[PDB]
Design a protein around this ligand. Sequence first.
Ligand SMILES: *[C@@H]1O[C@H](CO)[C@@H](O[C@@H]2O[C@H](CO)[C@@H](O[C@@H]3O[C@H](CO)[C@@H](O)[C@H](O[C@H]4O[C@H](CO)[C@@H](O)[C@H](O)[C@@H]4O[C@H]4O[C@H](CO)[C@@H](O)[C@H](O)[C@@H]4O)[C@@H]3O)[C@H](O)[C@H]2NC(C)=O)[C@H](O)[C@H]1NC(C)=O
Ligand SMILES: *[C@@H]1O[C@H](CO)[C@@H](O[C@@H]2O[C@H](CO)[C@@H](O)[C@H](O)[C@H]2NC(C)=O)[C@H](O)[C@H]1NC(C)=O
Ligand SMILES: *[C@@H]1O[C@H](CO)[C@@H](O[C@@H]2O[C@H](CO)[C@@H](O)[C@H](O)[C@H]2NC(C)=O)[C@H](O)[C@H]1NC(C)=O
Ligand SMILES: *[C@@H]1O[C@H](CO)[C@@H](O[C@@H]2O[C@H](CO)[C@@H](O)[C@H](O)[C@H]2NC(C)=O)[C@H](O)[C@H]1NC(C)=O
Ligand SMILES: *[C@@H]1O[C@H](CO)[C@@H](O[C@@H]2O[C@H](CO)[C@@H](O)[C@H](O)[C@H]2NC(C)=O)[C@H](O)[C@H]1NC(C)=O
Ligand SMILES: *[C@@H]1O[C@H](CO)[C@@H](O[C@@H]2O[C@H](CO)[C@@H](O)[C@H](O)[C@H]2NC(C)=O)[C@H](O)[C@H]1NC(C)=O
Ligand SMILES: *[C@@H]1O[C@H](CO)[C@@H](O[C@@H]2O[C@H](CO)[C@@H](O)[C@H](O)[C@H]2NC(C)=O)[C@H](O)[C@H]1NC(C)=O
Ligand SMILES: *[C@@H]1O[C@H](CO)[C@@H](O[C@@H]2O[C@H](CO)[C@@H](O)[C@H](O)[C@H]2NC(C)=O)[C@H](O)[C@H]1NC(C)=O
Ligand SMILES: *[C@@H]1O[C@H](CO)[C@@H](O[C@@H]2O[C@H](CO)[C@@H](O)[C@H](O)[C@H]2NC(C)=O)[C@H](O)[C@H]1NC(C)=O
Ligand SMILES: *[C@@H]1O[C@H](CO)[C@@H](O[C@@H]2O[C@H](CO)[C@@H](O)[C@H](O)[C@H]2NC(C)=O)[C@H](O)[C@H]1NC(C)=O
Ligand SMILES: *[C@@H]1O[C@H](CO)[C@@H](O[C@@H]2O[C@H](CO)[C@@H](O)[C@H](O)[C@H]2NC(C)=O)[C@H](O)[C@H]1NC(C)=O
Ligand SMILES: *[C@@H]1O[C@H](CO)[C@@H](O)[C@H](O)[C@H]1NC(C)=O
Ligand SMILES: *[C@@H]1O[C@H](CO)[C@@H](O)[C@H](O)[C@H]1NC(C)=O
Ligand SMILES: *[C@@H]1O[C@H](CO)[C@@H](O)[C@H](O)[C@H]1NC(C)=O
Ligand SMILES: *[C@@H]1O[C@H](CO)[C@@H](O)[C@H](O)[C@H]1NC(C)=O
Ligand SMILES: *[C@@H]1O[C@H](CO)[C@@H](O)[C@H](O)[C@H]1NC(C)=O
Ligand SMILES: *[C@@H]1O[C@H](CO)[C@@H](O)[C@H](O)[C@H]1NC(C)=O
Ligand SMILES: *[C@@H]1O[C@H](CO)[C@@H](O)[C@H](O)[C@H]1NC(C)=O
Ligand SMILES: *[C@@H]1O[C@H](CO)[C@@H](O)[C@H](O)[C@H]1NC(C)=O
Lengths: 441, 48, 130, 130
Amino acid sequence: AENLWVTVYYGVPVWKDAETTLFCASDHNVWATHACVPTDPNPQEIHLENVTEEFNMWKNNMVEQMHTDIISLWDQSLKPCVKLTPLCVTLQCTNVTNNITDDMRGELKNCSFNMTTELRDKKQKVYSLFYRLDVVQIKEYRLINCNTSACTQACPKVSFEPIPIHYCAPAGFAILKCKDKKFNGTGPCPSVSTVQCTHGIKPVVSTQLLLNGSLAEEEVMIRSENITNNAKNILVQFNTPVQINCTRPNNNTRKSIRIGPGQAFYATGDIIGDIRQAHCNVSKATWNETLGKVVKQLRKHFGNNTIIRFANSSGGDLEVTTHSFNCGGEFFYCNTSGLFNSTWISNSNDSITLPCRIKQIINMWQRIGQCMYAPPIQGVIRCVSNITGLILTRDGGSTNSTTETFRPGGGDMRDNWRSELYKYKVVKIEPLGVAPTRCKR
Amino acid sequence: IRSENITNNAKNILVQFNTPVQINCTRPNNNTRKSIRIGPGQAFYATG
Amino acid sequence: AVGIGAVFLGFLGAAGSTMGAASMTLTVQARNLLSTVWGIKQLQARVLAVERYLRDQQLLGIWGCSGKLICCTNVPWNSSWSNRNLSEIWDNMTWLQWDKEISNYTQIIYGLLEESQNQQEKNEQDLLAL
Amino acid sequence: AVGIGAVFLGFLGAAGSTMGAASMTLTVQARNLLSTVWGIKQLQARVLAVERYLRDQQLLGIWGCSGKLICCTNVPWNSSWSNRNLSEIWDNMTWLQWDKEISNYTQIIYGLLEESQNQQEKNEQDLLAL
Ligand SMILES: *[C@@H]1O[C@H](CO)[C@@H](O[C@@H]2O[C@H](CO)[C@@H](O[C@@H]3O[C@H](CO)[C@@H](O)[C@H](O[C@H]4O[C@H](CO)[C@@H](O)[C@H](O)[C@@H]4O[C@H]4O[C@H](CO)[C@@H](O)[C@H](O)[C@@H]4O)[C@@H]3O)[C@H](O)[C@H]2NC(C)=O)[C@H](O)[C@H]1NC(C)=O
Ligand SMILES: *[C@@H]1O[C@H](CO)[C@@H](O[C@@H]2O[C@H](CO)[C@@H](O)[C@H](O)[C@H]2NC(C)=O)[C@H](O)[C@H]1NC(C)=O
Ligand SMILES: *[C@@H]1O[C@H](CO)[C@@H](O[C@@H]2O[C@H](CO)[C@@H](O)[C@H](O)[C@H]2NC(C)=O)[C@H](O)[C@H]1NC(C)=O
Ligand SMILES: *[C@@H]1O[C@H](CO)[C@@H](O[C@@H]2O[C@H](CO)[C@@H](O)[C@H](O)[C@H]2NC(C)=O)[C@H](O)[C@H]1NC(C)=O
Ligand SMILES: *[C@@H]1O[C@H](CO)[C@@H](O[C@@H]2O[C@H](CO)[C@@H](O)[C@H](O)[C@H]2NC(C)=O)[C@H](O)[C@H]1NC(C)=O
Ligand SMILES: *[C@@H]1O[C@H](CO)[C@@H](O[C@@H]2O[C@H](CO)[C@@H](O)[C@H](O)[C@H]2NC(C)=O)[C@H](O)[C@H]1NC(C)=O
Ligand SMILES: *[C@@H]1O[C@H](CO)[C@@H](O[C@@H]2O[C@H](CO)[C@@H](O)[C@H](O)[C@H]2NC(C)=O)[C@H](O)[C@H]1NC(C)=O
Ligand SMILES: *[C@@H]1O[C@H](CO)[C@@H](O[C@@H]2O[C@H](CO)[C@@H](O)[C@H](O)[C@H]2NC(C)=O)[C@H](O)[C@H]1NC(C)=O
Ligand SMILES: *[C@@H]1O[C@H](CO)[C@@H](O[C@@H]2O[C@H](CO)[C@@H](O)[C@H](O)[C@H]2NC(C)=O)[C@H](O)[C@H]1NC(C)=O
Ligand SMILES: *[C@@H]1O[C@H](CO)[C@@H](O[C@@H]2O[C@H](CO)[C@@H](O)[C@H](O)[C@H]2NC(C)=O)[C@H](O)[C@H]1NC(C)=O
Ligand SMILES: *[C@@H]1O[C@H](CO)[C@@H](O[C@@H]2O[C@H](CO)[C@@H](O)[C@H](O)[C@H]2NC(C)=O)[C@H](O)[C@H]1NC(C)=O
Ligand SMILES: *[C@@H]1O[C@H](CO)[C@@H](O)[C@H](O)[C@H]1NC(C)=O
Ligand SMILES: *[C@@H]1O[C@H](CO)[C@@H](O)[C@H](O)[C@H]1NC(C)=O
Ligand SMILES: *[C@@H]1O[C@H](CO)[C@@H](O)[C@H](O)[C@H]1NC(C)=O
Ligand SMILES: *[C@@H]1O[C@H](CO)[C@@H](O)[C@H](O)[C@H]1NC(C)=O
Ligand SMILES: *[C@@H]1O[C@H](CO)[C@@H](O)[C@H](O)[C@H]1NC(C)=O
Ligand SMILES: *[C@@H]1O[C@H](CO)[C@@H](O)[C@H](O)[C@H]1NC(C)=O
Ligand SMILES: *[C@@H]1O[C@H](CO)[C@@H](O)[C@H](O)[C@H]1NC(C)=O
Ligand SMILES: *[C@@H]1O[C@H](CO)[C@@H](O)[C@H](O)[C@H]1NC(C)=O
């Protein structure tokens, strides 16, 4: 009676969730663009009407792929140049006290040691300036890493500056982007587009502060996998940036020592002029306004008549306890204590200065047994950056008290990538379909 | 009993049993182990 | 004829369109399907895509619809699978919604198609025997 | 309708069966064909399998039997190849024995099939010219 018959169609627009491997698209650097394809001058986007998709930032497979690719590129970049095997010798060290302030006392050590030469039957006597965090007493000191493993030197010619990278999908797969504002990273998105691939993402490595990121188009956004649980970090995205100016003012000097055939070690000769502490500056009124916006948004989730406290970091390693970043090739670790120190109750030109330290022996990723020795940078260094987000954690959270305390956090670098790839997902097409029609073979 | 060419004496003979024979092997010395650090993250294990 | 622009449809430009309108853009989707360790991964992805395409082509051939994008068959449509009439399907619904609705009636349809094709082949072979 | 179970025939399940019964399980065999240094070996094996499948499909298409598992043709059967009747072939012999028997008469059959297909195509082209 129906007289309707099955009919097969190939190439229908139907897709499903899937996982695959995206490839490069990017316009001497650590993040090698040589093995990455050039990007198209005019990217294309197709807005899908009447299509509402499901999104979840906390179960995105692209973050893991990005992390693995970044680590792999990092590993490849450090291969073809010197390994600092002979650096582990007994060092005779003294204090540096030539034109220093009251806060830099004991932070620098003038050390002398013996070293090999190009000929294996000759030795030389050399000296260099080391940081207090790099040497451990055995008047005799040794490098911190020799009792764990020998490890390489940073390679002078490659630069650490991040560059954008785009991830484009293979054939048979599509990338869907959610353009709905106020999207908190999980749930249904009604506005959807198909993009060949994403906007340029800078792999910025930092802790406790997201630098050179993206800004929300509507207002401050707060995201968390389970806001009720205190064990999950909270990601805060600003709508406007906060300028921060960091500097190392010491006039450093660099010298080269030939430690073998075609092998040179770069040491710090001496500092010309006064010695002062590297430090950063951030505006006070702008920070206060940003914190006001943040607490206003937090009151939406944590009650309207609750006291919100910003306090100091709990503790642990220097990297997790301090905002760690790279400026001008030098690794800064800084004590963001003057920022997250206040309490908020429901109801000109000075700037906050953070004095802070530099390091040379680096364990970038959370791994044990591989360092990275950064050669010194000659001369004064200054660098300006934008702060566009925060990674907070709720302390305690019991029902005994009516006050919520938030502290800075970090450590894991997957959260840094999660803040950029939150609005993208990958799907695979299902060309085959069956429908009713009135033929008969 | 299996062999590629049983007549030839240059070919090994494989014998497969139908039941096993238990064998008990032992070293009864109470050895002691110590570690010597021979370099950065390199340890050699010696008999004390 | 002077002042009107022209453009081409995208890979998934007809996703939001109705089934009747979306069925006229099968070639745009069909064409896209074909086209140290990183090289291994790319080669594996390409080989997997080729294998999937070959499997789809073989499945189409098993039903007797080889070398066609649209091939309407002899299997009748059961009312249990869907009760909506044609007017409410090809003019008021999209392909995604249709796939969602009948997602739990596909394997039986495939089996019926295979059996019908086998019966047709047997009947044709018997007819050619005369 | 209660008291009996159901199982599915496996790969090469009809190897010992007669040709007539074994010809009804072509799909199970057909479907199986498609689906650091070790990765190279596996990729090479997959590519070789794909190439073999494509070569077989091209050979089938050359004879005009494209997209078909059973395709009976116009070439008459010579008595020299085999004098056995149908009753002694499709009901008393297996595919392995049949392949063993006529192993030395295959290339001539392939050439005859190719020539017959070429002649049929030429005749069809001549007919369509009118
Ligand atoms: C957030 O973004 C902002 C802006 O995008 C970033 O700020 C920029 O940072 C870059 C990199 O530090 C900086 O570019 C440098 O400017 C210096 C001053 O002009 C240059 O001297 C420097 O060139 C040296 O380094 C290059 C490698 O990066 C070498 O290729 C080049 O030859 C130079 O090296 C010579 O000099 C050194 C030092 O004397 C010596 O050791 C070498 O042997 C060689 O002789 C770069 O061009 C931009 O100027 C910054 N822009 C602004 C507006 O400040 C900021 O860093 C980002 N934030 C984070 C956290 O990354
Ligand atoms: C670090 O120590 C070295 C060695 O003691 C210092 O180099 C000496 O500097 C004095 C001048 O103050 C010269 O007279 C000596 O000849 C130098 N010694 C050598 C071996 O060259 C160096 O000045 C010290 N640097 C700092 C910052 O204290
Ligand atoms: C570099 O090596 C020389 C010798 O090759 C060291 O001088 C010796 O120092 C020890 C003390 O550790 C004395 O007991 C020896 O008598 C010294 N020998 C000579 C010939 O002077 C020198 O100390 C080494 N340099 C450093 C910085 O340790
Ligand atoms: C978010 O976290 C809270 C706190 O853990 C979860 O609620 C708890 O769930 C566990 C499950 O075994 C219970 O034992 C606790 O008693 C619950 N505590 C409270 C305060 O409810 C909550 O389920 C999480 N959210 C989701 C969606 O899983
Ligand atoms: C951070 O702010 C301090 C002031 O709080 C700056 O110190 C001044 O720096 C200027 C340089 O142009 C000098 O002229 C002043 O004499 C300094 N004043 C004091 C009190 O130190 C410092 O330079 C700023 N640093 C950065 C990186 O912005
Ligand atoms: C960070 O540095 C920038 C530039 O080095 C500062 O911006 C300058 O501020 C002065 C004083 O208001 C102006 O005269 C300049 O025109 C500004 N230049 C630029 C490029 O903006 C900024 O004030 C500094 N911020 C902090 C907190 O130290
Ligand atoms: C956050 O502020 C507290 C309070 O000042 C810091 O606690 C101090 O820690 C130092 C050791 O580094 C002690 O000498 C002080 O006595 C402590 N203060 C008090 C009042 O007891 C805490 O260290 C700060 N956080 C970080 C990461 O430095
Ligand atoms: C981070 O900065 C804060 C603020 O300067 C430090 O807290 C001070 O620590 C010293 C320790 O010598 C105390 O004497 C001060 O009283 C502390 N200030 C206050 C306001 O309590 C803190 O120690 C710094 N972090 C680290 C690890 O040193
Ligand atoms: C910090 O943020 C400001 C504002 O977002 C940036 O200035 C903008 O830069 C973009 C570059 O694509 C321009 O299109 C805008 O017109 C600029 N806006 C203003 C108000 O200047 C600035 O470049 C950022 N700095 C860093 C280092 O990222
Ligand atoms: C098994 O081994 C025997 C011993 O080698 C083979 O017999 C020999 O074959 C060689 C071939 O040149 C002769 O020169 C010897 O005189 C033969 N000796 C004997 C005692 O027969 C025998 O052929 C082997 N079996 C097979 C199947 O090859
Ligand atoms: C192998 O056999 C010998 C005996 O031929 C065993 O020696 C005895 O071991 C037991 C251990 O429980 C002692 O109590 C006896 O006193 C031993 N007797 C002698 C004569 O040595 C030996 O232990 C056996 N070893 C194994 C591994 O089975
Ligand atoms: C170097 O200075 C530090 C800090 O004042 C002090 O603790 C240390 O004992 C000094 N070492 C010397 C003078 O050898
Ligand atoms: C190396 O020395 C430091 C300080 O002396 C110590 O904390 C660390 O545990 C040592 N490494 C190992 C592998 O024991
Ligand atoms: C915010 O995230 C929660 C997570 O459970 C989700 O339920 C909610 O729908 C999100 N907000 C919006 C507007 O979708
Ligand atoms: C650092 O020292 C060098 C060498 O004396 C000098 O040329 C340069 O001007 C100094 N830098 C500053 C900022 O004074
Ligand atoms: C923290 O805030 C309190 C305000 O009560 C202030 O007295 C103290 O100096 C601040 N400390 C820092 C390190 O900013
Ligand atoms: C081997 O020596 C250790 C240390 O004295 C002892 O604990 C252990 O029991 C000894 N082994 C035997 C089998 O007695
Ligand atoms: C989207 O849906 C509306 C009604 O729900 C319909 O009028 C419109 O045609 C649809 N979009 C397209 C591209 O057909
Ligand atoms: C095996 O052979 C016997 C006799 O040759 C025959 O009866 C039997 O049917 C054969 N097996 C199958 C599965 O046909």
